[PDB]
């Protein structure tokens, strides 16, 4: 019972974005698909929906003319296309599944962040934050655009004590972010620590290893 969305990307103003929603295991069977956006710091706005098999689409008048929602049964994928991209369109776009008795949206995709910008993508540089009865270590993910980056520790193994900070915008115009984790001193010389950074809009992936100073 999953929905998987396309990666986040940057788009020049006046262009188009097509965002995809993969209904896992062909579960277009008896499920409408809705699209909902959340502009950063804002609330949830319904863009429209489609009954996949009939292919009939329903749009909010706010978006009529700019947005096209489509479904492809042989792929089990819903699509949202937004054209004439303005800065106000920078948002996280969500697909959810609509069930037709009660009208609920009982499962939602992870969301795709679309950033409207004249600037081109730039992948991050990953720097280690070296440790020196508990000790802290981490990773500095510096100088990337646009958002987001994902960080995990040891391919998903380490999660306890992990703090990934919200990105800060620097005066250079680029984002920067640090991820940190607290671990016992004893496990230092023995256990290995690799942070895993993924910057989908620049297709950058980095696995830096953190070692004592």
């Amino acid at each position: 019972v999953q929905l998987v969305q396309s990666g986040a990307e940057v788009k020049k103003p006046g262009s188009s974005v097509k965002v995809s929603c993969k209904a896992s295991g062909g579960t277009f069977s008896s499920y409408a698909i809705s699209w909902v956006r959340q502009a950063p710091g804002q609330g949830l706005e319904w863009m429209g929906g489609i009954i996949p098999i009939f292919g009939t689409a329903n749009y909010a008048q706010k978006f009529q003319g700019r947005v096209t929602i489509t479904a492809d049964e042989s792929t089990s994928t819903a699509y949202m296309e937004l054209s004439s991209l303005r800065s106000e369109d920078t948002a996280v776009y969500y697909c959810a599944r609509y069930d037709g008795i009660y009208g609920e949206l009982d499962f939602w995709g992870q969301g795709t962040l679309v950033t409207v910008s004249s600037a081109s993508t730039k992948g991050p540089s990953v720097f280690p934050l070296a440790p020196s009865g508990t000790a802290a270590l981490g990773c500095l993910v510096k100088d990337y655009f646009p958002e987001p980056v994902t960080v995990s520790w040891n391919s998903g193994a380490l999660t306890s004590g992990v703090h990934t900070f919200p990105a800060v915008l620097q005066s250079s115009g680029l984002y920067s972010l640090s991820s940190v984790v607290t671990v016992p001193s004893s496990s230092l010389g023995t256990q290995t620590y690799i942070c895993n950074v993924n910057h989908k809009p620049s297709n950058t992936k980095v696995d830096k290893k953190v070692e004592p100073k």
Binding site: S34, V36, G43, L44, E45, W46, G48, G49, N58, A60, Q61, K62, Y94, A96, Y98, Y102, G103, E104, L105, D106, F107, W108, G109, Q110, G111, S125, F127, P128, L129, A130, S132, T134, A136, G138, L140, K142, H163, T164, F165, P166, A167, V168, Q170, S176, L177, S178, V180, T182, K213
Partner: protein, 214 residues
């Protein structure tokens, strides 16, 4: 369009408190009212549908009620993981419309930070920039002073801070302060210090390093 109005838009309470959020529709929506919960950076999750029915997996402390125009979401004893924004949504008629969202935050006792300092990496200095990082870990409340001293001179407008959202297990914060200068500016000073003031501390905590010392 049916307008949805939540009250309040923001709210603070202690673990175990009864929390009540209100949703009001501009016109009758019968019982086609759903409640979503959205933790930060994550996707909304369905809690309640048909005004009053719990999605399976949702703890029984959550409950919903009402019909027509007036609806209420209740958390009977608030828990640390209940930290989130909460939205109501009508599906009686298209377009589907949401309330503005209600941010629920937890009120807990003072907790002191654990302070750490990180000198810049070798790899970063090669690129000609130094980022010095100070970390306050697991504290409450959010309000803290972080003072950078460089050779005992207070710094101004060369650092930035970032704070995590309230933790889902213990309701604390964490904060990073990052001082950034060029390798040149960096290599002209020796003592790099981070003075922390927070009311969970008896007096200010300083963590420092000397540039070069192994």
């Amino acid at each position: 369009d049916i307008q949805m109005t939540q009250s309040p838009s923001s709210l603070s309470a202690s673990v175990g408190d009864r929390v009540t959020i209100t949703c009001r529709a501009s016109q009758s929506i019968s019982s086609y009212l759903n409640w979503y919960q959205q933790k930060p950076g994550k996707a909304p999750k369905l809690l309640i549908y048909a005004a009053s029915s719990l999605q399976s997996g949702v703890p029984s402390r959550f409950s919903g009620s009402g019909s027509g125009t007036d609806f209420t979401l209740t958390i009977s004893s608030l828990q640390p993981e209940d930290f989130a924004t909460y939205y109501c949504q009508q599906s009686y008629s298209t377009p589907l419309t949401f309330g503005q969202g209600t941010k629920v935050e937890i009120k807990r006792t003072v907790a002191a930070p654990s302070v750490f300092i990180f000198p810049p990496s070798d790899e970063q200095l090669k690129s000609g920039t130094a980022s010095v990082v100070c970390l306050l870990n697991n504290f409450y409340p959010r309000e803290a002073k972080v003072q950078w001293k460089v050779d005992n001179a207070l710094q101004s407008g060369n650092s930035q801070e970032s704070v995590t959202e309230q933790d889902s297990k213990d309701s604390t914060y964490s904060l990073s302060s990052t001082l950034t200068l060029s390798k040149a500016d960096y290599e002209k000073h020796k003592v790099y210090a981070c003075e922390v003031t927070h009311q969970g501390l008896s007096s200010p905590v300083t963590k420092s390093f000397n540039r070069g010392e192994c």
